[PDB]
Every structure is written in structure tokens, then in C-alpha cells.
Ligand binder design. Sequence first.
Ligand code: NA
Ligand code: NA
Ligand code: NA
Ligand code: NA
Ligand code: NA
Ligand code: NA
Lengths: 321, 317, 317, 321
Amino acid sequence: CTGLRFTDDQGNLYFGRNLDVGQDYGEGVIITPRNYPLPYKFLDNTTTKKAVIGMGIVVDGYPSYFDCFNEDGLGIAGLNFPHFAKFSDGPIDGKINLASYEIMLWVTQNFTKVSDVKEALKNVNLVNEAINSSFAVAPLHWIISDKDEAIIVEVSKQYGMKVFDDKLGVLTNSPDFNWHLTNLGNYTGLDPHDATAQSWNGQKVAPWGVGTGSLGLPGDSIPADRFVKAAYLNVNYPTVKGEKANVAKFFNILKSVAMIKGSVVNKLGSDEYTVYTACYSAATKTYYCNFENDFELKTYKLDDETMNADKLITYHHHHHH
Amino acid sequence: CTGLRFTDDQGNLYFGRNLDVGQDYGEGVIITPRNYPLPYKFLDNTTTKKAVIGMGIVVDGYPSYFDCFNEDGLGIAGLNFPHFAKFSDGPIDGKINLASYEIMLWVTQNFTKVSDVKEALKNVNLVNEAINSSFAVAPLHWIISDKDEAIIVEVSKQYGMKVFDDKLGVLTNSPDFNWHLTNLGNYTGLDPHDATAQSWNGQKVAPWGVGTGSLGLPGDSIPADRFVKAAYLNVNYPTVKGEKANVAKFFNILKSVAMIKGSVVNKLGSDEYTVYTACYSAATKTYYCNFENDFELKTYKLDDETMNADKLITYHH
Amino acid sequence: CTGLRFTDDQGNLYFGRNLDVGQDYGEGVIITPRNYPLPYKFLDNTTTKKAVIGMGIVVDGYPSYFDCFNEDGLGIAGLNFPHFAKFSDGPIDGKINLASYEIMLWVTQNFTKVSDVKEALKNVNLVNEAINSSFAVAPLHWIISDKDEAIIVEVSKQYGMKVFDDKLGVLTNSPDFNWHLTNLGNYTGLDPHDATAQSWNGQKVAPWGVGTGSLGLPGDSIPADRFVKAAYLNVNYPTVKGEKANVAKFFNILKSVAMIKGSVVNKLGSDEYTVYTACYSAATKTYYCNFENDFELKTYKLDDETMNADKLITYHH
Amino acid sequence: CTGLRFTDDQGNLYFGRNLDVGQDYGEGVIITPRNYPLPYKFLDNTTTKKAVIGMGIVVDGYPSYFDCFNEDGLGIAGLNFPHFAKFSDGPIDGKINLASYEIMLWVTQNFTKVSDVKEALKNVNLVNEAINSSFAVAPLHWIISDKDEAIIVEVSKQYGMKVFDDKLGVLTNSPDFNWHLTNLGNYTGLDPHDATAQSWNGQKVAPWGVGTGSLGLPGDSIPADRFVKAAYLNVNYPTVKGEKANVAKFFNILKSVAMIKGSVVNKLGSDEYTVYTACYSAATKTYYCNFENDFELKTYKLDDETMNADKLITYHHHHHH
Ligand code: NA
Ligand code: NA
Ligand code: NA
Ligand code: NA
Ligand code: NA
Ligand code: NA
């Protein structure tokens, strides 16, 4: 998985992710309206105050989001953080205790600014508890973004709870976020500018085509390599204008770092690949996505009808794997 | 540029290209109908026998294609071959003489099988002449494909005229095709299968995520590196069923090797990037494309209305 | 710089380093005999109990070692740790307080087992102080080894004091050791075993020569890349028998990851390169080294003559 | 195998090779003196006119060299060219016909200048014939050098006989030499000069140590990769002064691209590695070498005694594999 965000010239946010997996989870687009029941394991039960849209599954009426975005332009995506993620084995007295699956709706229901999220997380404790005993706890880390900043939330057995500022606007998988930031120092030899003709002891050595400045840019799907490439692409892509151009820019970047079907086979014999790419446009409250076997963009929207429905709106699962 | 072709389980062909350029050319989708005036510089002027569709520009009523595909399911794409391509100084009596730009229509108008194209190419001579003195001659090589086989056509100062069978189904830019084929042997260490945990003198060293078998796969836009990656993806992508899934598979592969805006700046200071990606489905006679700033798929079709038109059908730029 | 250690089949240790620098330091081989005056900035001055040998310079009668090894077979090498290393602003009552440069002799004079070194390091505080105001404090980390185990000692502004077990037997430069250990999981696709011939949709794609399994192994001098390669070579090099073969194995590995003159130019315009490679054999108490401009192995030895000298034995620069 | 040559400031040649193999050939240093019998399969038998030194084996009194160097400063090394090398299946009327193993002594016995070799090769035909029927024909290509130029000689089923000028002063194995020259164009992004600190959308990204300009330089033992690295090292290594510094410079480069034991296992299960590195200094007529298990330099010399001996001088084989 790769998460990506950036803005246009006017501060309109484009924020989303590839879902790169080795099996089918039965997910679909879910719109959760305002005033929908919202239970918490360790806090007072309440109701939703903001409408949200995203991909996920529904478990006993609870929308369990892979990624989700509120009507006020703040979103969050959960990505795998295997061999690192480790949550508290129980709630801690005095903290805001959240089972780790509850962070999706806790963030999107209570905040519009990432600066506020960052301050509130100082008293948050994530707990190793599933929605019910038929589910395992997913070892996630998260990217959260508004139009002004993205932050990374990681809780690991190795480092405890860390919240990073993410000026690159990207996130992939393991290892931890500081590791990937530090790795970028080893790729400072990269340069978008082409090389030109050279003399190697009088032998002319010259580029055969464009692209030679990015020698060493990795093209495989190892999480560290997708991180380097996605960060390099995002910071070098010019700001563009208009909804169509920004959505297209978003899919250009994430399709460049997609996991292509047949090129990755996991240790159990199963293909791992990008099953969907999704982009939320805050300015239009539109969730765009396409699928490995269905490339035309689909759109789903928060509007005066969907934001005020009396139940969840769930689009039937598009099948894969 | 990257050209790409494959088939589904029934022998339906999906064939197209990325256009990676550092300038605007004014191109759009052009349907050339049957019975359209077809002049030749060194042969008898004639008219078209088959409708074709593709991206190009129109010059004095002549459709100048970047890629084009005929109603019978044979197509051709022209890609830059800089520092290599060279054509004859002029025509040679005894040969089928074509100015290099005329090979697009020459191929799609007269053939439906690639086997026939390669047989006819033994009597062909490509001439270094543009349509007129206002345009330079493009230093192109070509990929040509039907449902059974793809071939590469290269004419170089270094090697003369060469025609290769292309079982990888891909083409990029310079150097020559045999160079790229040879390069693949240096990447036999690539493996779609993930590595697993290892003991480095008792230190556990294990993958952090999936993908470790393709260590060393290049992600830059150098033509040699796009060639390796496009070939590796195409030959490992499973065969899929139906029009929707095959069109998506095509765009999945070509967007993976796209040249991303801002990541390549040429020596004149211009961004080079994939301005469009196009896929022709022979089974539906449909040309699909999207663009750098408009990601939705647009579709254009050879049907009884467009194949029999009384003019060129030129969509917008 | 790259530090390296391994043992033979009998537990004899071979341990040393490349020195990769962009300037001349005036160094030479220094044998410090038993009973030599050993001052400390924050402890009782004393004298040496064990003879040591290594590369260094002498400052006001004090042997300032780049690496050094004691007669009992324990050694230590100091390597640059830029952008990370930071020591205390001053001494802290209750701790064993050492100016960072004194850790070379502190370790080699008081210990013969690495297990004891790591136990004692829990009460140690390294201070940002040079021998005098004429020299800057070097931002070092250290590899320490006996025949059983090697450990890394890192004191950073980011993480404080850290001591790692080093089963790979290697150390380079920045970033921190845990970062490098973690990086190895991204290279689990490396395999000493060659690939063999493959069918890419019927195109035979086969290795041109041996080596294809290590596709993606980096050959540049970035510290992360030298770390990966040195670790990969060390853990895959077979155990060999006898002094000659083990010394050669050591130099084979370190010359493979040497920084080659002219291939690295720092931001001040100076060539950075491996000026010497040195190997200490504990079994023969012999320090072997060669230099960028003199490849023959030179040897220096701790024996009953040199261990009991009445001065420092300083060989030439 | 990697072949390497360069000169000092005064035109003194340093020329030699790594021998990277998966089995033991029983080779040793051989000095062939002047006036030694010199048979030819397809030419008049004669005697040696120049003394030569190098590594090889002796077959029925014939010194069969892996590499060899004459007293006048011209040398040749044979390297494997598998899947390419193909010699004529018989002598051709009117040509200078040489069985391919005869090129070692034909070159070193008749020439002092590579310019003359290049002209004479225009009438040479290499023949697919072994010294006797107990030996197979080795699929070799060759690097030949004097103090002024090195040339590459390749005869392939693919391209016929080709003679290249080699300004890089290096050679490895397959594929063909023009392929490797052309490959260099893809590495024009390499630069000995370090990168410096950068701003990736405000995130400081800076080198952790020196070396960052050579991102993408390969360190594996694939022949194409050793070619790139050896060429890059050779053309960037400064000219140095004096016998000791030039010999050391030579071994520095070839030990950098050596095949390290245990890191390469061929498809039959055997370790492939650099068993010896050898350097001939034309100025001192000295053959320097060391071995995988014996690192101290050994020396062997053409002098007034060895050049005028009445039989071959053969040093006993140093064992490996
Ligand atoms: Na509750
Ligand atoms: Na570069
Ligand atoms: Na005509
Ligand atoms: Na004191
Ligand atoms: Na591999
Ligand atoms: Na004869």
C-alpha cells in the first residue's frame, strides 16, 4: 500500500491510497451519514457528527474503514505495519483509550485540523482489541491529512507511540517512518535533470534517451523502494490546476508505484497486487477509485442526500482475487 | 515511449503505447475511412481499402499517425530511435520505396497478417524524406502486431534494415532491439516469488514486506530500464478474461512504466512525460486513451458509421 | 571506513578495518608496551597492564589510536559517525567518566572479554573533550571484538548510549547501527546461487555469465551500501584454515568494499579513498597492513621483545 | 574475469587480469625463453624470437597461456566469451590460419606494437581446433595492449571477427564488447562528486556520508556490472608515479571488482571466485600476482638468465578449489 496527498494552488486537498493485498476482504464503498450510532469500547457511546466516505466493511452495523474522509476535508488511511505495530494490552487509567480499529472514526468524527489531532493524541492510548472475537487486530499505522499537513501515527513494540510530520505526503509499509526518512539521504544522487555526453578517457559516453539523472531509482515493490519513488515523484510533480488535472496527477503517481499483478507472489503462493486506487477530493467531497480489473474511474459523493441518510449507504463489493 | 501488446484467452489482441514527449504536437484521434485519397511519394497514388484509427495530426489532408490500427486487427506504432535511425538518401529502382512517414498507412492499408508484412519488407526501402520541407524526418523505429505475433522494424546507420520477432510484446527507445533483448539476460535474478527469513551468521534477516524477489528492478525512465520492467511485467501478468479486465491490465502495465511529469527534465530544460496512454482492442475495434491531465478513459470506435465516412473524422486535441 | 571480524575453525580471531579519509593524518603503527604512563582526564592516572598495537598518532607522549588490539586478543576500532555522535558536556559524578578519545586504551587495557566490556559500559559516560584545544573531538562510534562476539558502541544525540551485538561482524559509518541492521531485510532477495535459463513467453532469457543471483548488490561507497555488501560477503565467505588463508580472506573482503581513489570527491573537492587496510591476527599477535600506494603486506608483532619495551615503538608514516 | 591496463606518467604499462573460475586448472607461472621450439598447426614451425612470461599450463612441451607478456612490453590475456565465441570450422585458403589457442604466442612472438597487430589481423582466420584431442576449444575473446593502445579481439557466431579500440582499458566476459560500450550510456548519471543537502518540499534530505554521487553503481559479479564498475574506476583513477604506486593502483582496482569466494555459486553447485590477480609491469619485466588464499604479492621476472634458458621455467602449481 502507498498513501499519497498533495494540494492544488488554492489549497484543495487530494488524498488517498493504493490497496495492495494478497486476498479479497469483501470491501466496498461506505457512506456513513450524520447522526449514525457510534459505540466505543472504552468511552461513552455517541453518534456521528460528520458524514464520512471511504472503503471498508460493515461489522454488525459498524463501518470498519480501510480509509475514510469527512465532509470537512480531513481524512485518514490505515496501512499495514507488520513486524512493528504493537498496541497496549489493555486500557490505561486516565488516558483516552481507543481500540486500534476505532481511530478511523474517532479522528474523522472529532477533528477538522491535523494540528488539533496532534495535540489530542498526546493523551491517547491505542489498545490491542478487535471489534469482536471473530476478528484479529490489524497491525496498522496511519497517515492523517488536512489541506495543511499530513502526519504519521505509529505505535510499535520497538519505539512506542510516535507522531511524525510528513512533508513528503507519502506513506508505505514497514519499517518505521523515521527509517524511511533516513533512507532518503542515501538517494541524494537522484536528479530529474538528464545527464549529457561525457568523455571516458576519450571514449564518448552519452545518454541514449532521457531519464539518465534518476539512475538508481528503484522500481520494485519492496515498501522502502515504493517509499523512495513515491516521495521523489510527489515532491517533483508540479502543482496543477483544476479538479480533473489534480485527480489525474494523483492516479499518475499512484499507478506508477502500483504493485502489478503477477510481479509479486507471497510466500504462500498468492499474487499480491494493487486491487484498487482511491482519491478523495476535499473540494468536491468526491471519492474516486478504480480497480485492477476495471480501469475507468468510479465516483461516490457526500452530498445533501447521502450526508443525511438514516442508515449506511453501502455499495456492493466489486470482486477480486 | 513504451509500446505493449498481449492477447486474452481467445486470441483477442490488446495493443497500444505511451507517448512520452517534451513538447505539444497538436495530436488527436483520427479515423481514416475506407476509400480515402492516399498519395505516395514514390508509388502510384491510390485510396484506402481499410478503415484505420489512431493518434496523429493531419497535414494537407494526409493523416500523419503516431500509432494506428486497421479494422482487421493489425496495428503499428512509431517510437523514437535517436542516434540510430537512418533511412536512404533517395529511392532505389526495383524496391518498394516509401518515405519513412508513409509506412504507417502502407502497413495498415495492405496487410492483415504480420507474416505477410515481414515477407513484403524484404523488398522495401525507407527514404529520408518528410511530407514537405516544413517538417523534419522523425528518427523512428516501429512495433507491428496482429493477434499472433509482434515484430520490430529498425533501420539504422549501424546495422541497416532489421526485422525482429518480439515475443516480449514490448518496445521502447534507443539502443537497438537486439541490445535490449541481450540486456534481459542480466536480469535473470529477478523472481516474482518473495524471499523468506534468513540466518546471516545467526542474525535473523527477513523481509519487512512483500516484493523482495524483484530486488534490482529499475524504476527510472531510461529506455533500457523501461524495457526491462515492461517486459518483466508483461510476461508475468496472468492472462485475463473479457474486455474490461484486459483493457485494465493494459493500462495497469503502461501506467507502471509511465514517465511521470517533473521526474525527467531534458537537456533543454523541458519536462518529458507520458502525455497519453492508448489501447486498441481488436475484438471491439475500440481505441481507448487517457491523458496526463484527464485520467478518465475516452473511447473511439471503428463501426459501420465511421468506417464508411465521407471525410476524416478528427476528434479534438 | 569498514570494520570487519571473523574467526577460523579453531576460534582464532581476525579483526581490522579500512581507513577511508580525504586527508593525511600522519599515522603509523604504534606498539604501546606494558607499564607505560597512562593518564586519564577524569580518573586516577595509571600505567598500562597489557601491550597493545595499532594505527594512530602520538600526542604529547599519548598514543592516539585509530584502531588497537591487546595481547590477549581483544580489539577496538573507531570509525566516523557524523551527524549522530554526541557525548556529554562534562563529567557526571558516579559514572566512569572518559573523554571519548580515551575509550581506545580504556577498553584494551582493562578487558579480555567483550561480555565484561558491555557490563562495564552501563556505568560509563563519554565526555565531549579532546586531549587539548589543538584537536577537535572526533564524532566516532566503535566496534569491539574478541574471538566470541563483536559489539557496536554508539552514543548519539538522537538515541543516547547504545550497545549492540554484531553477528554480521561489520561496521561502517552513518546512520546508526539499528538502521543498517533493518536495511538488510530489504536485500533478502540476494542469493549467491546463479539464476538459470528462463522462458519469457517463449523468448529464451538466460545468464551471460555467473553472478546473476546477486542482482541489486550495491557497488558504490555510500556507508549503507558498503555495510550491506560487507555483511553479505562476510556471512557467505566459507570458514578457512590457517593463518595465510585467513589473512587473505580478510583482505579479499575489505579490498572488495574499498573506497577507490578518484571515485569519490567530497563537497570540499578532495578525493576520499581507502588509505590503508589492516588486519590483526590474535593467534599470532600480528598486525598486517597495506596502503593505497604500497600493496605488499607489512607485518608488526607483539612478542616478548616489543611487549616489554621501555618506550613506544613507533614505525614510520 | 576482468582485464585491466593503464600507464604511468612516463608511458610505462601496467596490464593484467583477475582469473575468476569455478574449478582448478592446475596452472602456474611459465617463462618461455628465446629460441624455444614453436610449432603451428597451419603455418611453418619455427622458434620463439622473444621471451614471454605468464600464467598457464604446459601441454606436451607447449606453453598454453591464460595471459602472457613479451620482453618488449606487449601482452595479451584470454578471457571467456561463452554463448558468443565461435571460430572457423577449418582453415581458409589464403588466410593466416591460427587455431584459437595459438593466438597467445603468435601475437607475443611477432609484434611489439598493437597498431601492427591490428593490421595483421585483417588477414587472420581463427580456427576451431584444440592443441590435441584430449582438450576442448576454449570459447575465448582477447584483450591485447602495448603502452599506447589496447584492442579487443572477438570472433562470434553473431558478428564474425571484430577488432575494437578499447579506450576504457578493461574487458570482462559476455556479451560482446560493443554491447558493453553501449551499456555505458545508461550510466551517465554516475558522478564521483558527492551530492549535498536538498529540500524535498521542506524536508531536509542530506547525505549521511560520502559516495552519494555514484548511486546505481553495481557491485555484483555479473560481467556487464563488473565492466561498468571497472571502466568507471579505471578512467577516474588518477595517474600515479613509480612502480610501487602503479602496481598498488592496479591491485586496488582489480581487487575492487574481484569475485569473492562464497558470494557466487554456479548452477553445478561450485564456488566461482577470483583465484589469482596478476599484473605485468613492462618497465621492470616483472609479473606480480597474489591468490585467494595467499595475499602477499609474488614476483617473477624476465631477465638475462630466464630469457636465455634452454627449456621452459615452470613454477609449481599453487593449489585452489
Ligand atoms: Na462505550
Ligand atoms: Na546520479
Ligand atoms: Na505518387
Ligand atoms: Na587523572
Ligand atoms: Na534476486
Ligand atoms: Na606447422
